[PDB]
Amino acid sequence: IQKTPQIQVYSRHPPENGKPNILNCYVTQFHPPHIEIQMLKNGKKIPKVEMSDMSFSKDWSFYILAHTEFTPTETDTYACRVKHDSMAEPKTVYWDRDM
Amino acid sequence: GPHSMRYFETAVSRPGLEEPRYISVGYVDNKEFVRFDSDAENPRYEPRAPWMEQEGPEYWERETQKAKGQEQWFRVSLRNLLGYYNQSAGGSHTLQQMSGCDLGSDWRLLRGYLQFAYEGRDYIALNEDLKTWTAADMAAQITRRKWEQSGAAEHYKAYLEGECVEWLHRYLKNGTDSPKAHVTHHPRVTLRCWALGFYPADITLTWQLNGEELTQDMELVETRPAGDGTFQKWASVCRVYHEGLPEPLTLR
Amino acid sequence: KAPYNXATM
């Protein structure tokens, strides 16, 4: 059976403008493992995105962690775009400094 | 305290290539410390940990030779399983294996694990006794009859009770952050309790202003990694319980 | 140390 990914984007620290940080894109609960992940910065993809090795959870579904260091600014938006078989088109999730 | 070791092996056949891709990842105390990937420069077992780099050259040669063995083992079974389920060419399939030892404070084994899964679903598993097998599909009956007639359990039991618990001890003799919490006040009002920068992922949040725990609504997210060896978690609707905490936190 | 399976499936 195939499982659509669960994507969630979040910061390491609570974002304050002027401070380094890590932007995270956590993709979980998917199957089969073949998946494409890209992090966006105002629609432009972020190069040099260190991404976790892939392991799988106790329910056998796969998860993978996408993260990059960054310094957030209050006008710019960051997003994560994910490509999987179980989805028609790629799904994009925007980071919000809220919750 | 309590410790553990695990090996998550994965093999995926894809329509388009002849040999399936095989990955093996090792974990000491739920932290990755070594990996193998048949898609690499030329595949081998590389360290993924700071404290693992001091292993002898003979160590990586035996481990890489074993991974070549598992690779083939996964290539044959993957072909065997197409027949057990009357599948034909054209699809993608996954065989997964999870093995490891949980040992306790006395440094003796508590429970070993040996479990397989096909197409993400359970296939066959060594029980807690290490002697019998649990199989759910009728296709896995052929396998259980084969393995229990060829003494597989006793071999796996020898690894779990022997090599596993011995080497995990040697790994640990070569090498605990508590969470800082905040609460988000934003009215829509819903309250959110954040727990950040803790290790290990053992965390537990709760909402009781009236002294009673809450599960009506009370939206939670499961612990997720930060970009470094820590983890975070928040809860919606605040005592925070952690193994590093001498007393659970209180914030409102 | 990684395991090492005996009989195939």
Numbering used by the authors:
A (entry chain B): 1 to 99
B (entry chain A): 1 to 175, 182 to 194, 199 to 247, 259 to 273
C (entry chain C): 1 to 9
Original authors' sentences:
Presentation of pathogen-derived epitopes by major histocompatibility complex I (MHC-I) can lead to the activation and expansion of specific CD8+ T cell clones, eventually resulting in the destruction of infected target cells. The interface surface that results from the combination of each peptide and MHC-I is key for recognition by the T cell receptor (TCR) on CD8+ T cells. More recently, Achour and co-workers also addressed whether vaccination with p3P-modified APLs would enable the tuning of endogenous CD8+ T cell recognition toward a viral immune escape variant. It is well established that infection of C57/Bl6 mice with lymphocytic choriomeningitis virus (LCMV) induces robust CTL responses toward the immunodominant H-2Db-restricted epitope gp33 (KAVYNFATM).32−34 Upon CTL pressure, a limited number of mutations in gp33 emerge, with consistent patterns, allowing for viral escape from CD8+ T-cell recognition.
As a result of the l- to d-symmetry, the side chain of p6f takes a different conformation in H-2Db/F6f compared to H-2Db/gp33. Interestingly, the aromatic ring of peptide residue p4Y, essential for recognition by the TCR P14, is profoundly affected by p6f and rotates clockwise from its conformation in gp33. The situation is very similar in H-2Db/V3P_F6f compared to H-2Db/V3P. In particular, the rotation of p6f in H-2Db/V3P_F6f prevents the H-2Db residue H155 to rotate counter clock wise and to assume a TCR-bound-like conformation, in contrast to that observed in H-2Db/V3P. Differences in the position of the H-2Db residues R62 and E163 in both H-2Db/F6f and H-2Db/V3P_F6f are also observed. However, the introduction of the l- to d-modification significantly reduced the binding affinity of the TCR P14 to H-2Db/pep complexes, even in the presence of the p3P modification. Our biochemical, biophysical, and structural characterization indicate that the l- to d-amino acid substitution at p6F in gp33 and V3P is well tolerated by H-2Db/peptide complexes, providing to our knowledge the first crystal structures of pMHC complexes including a d-amino acid.
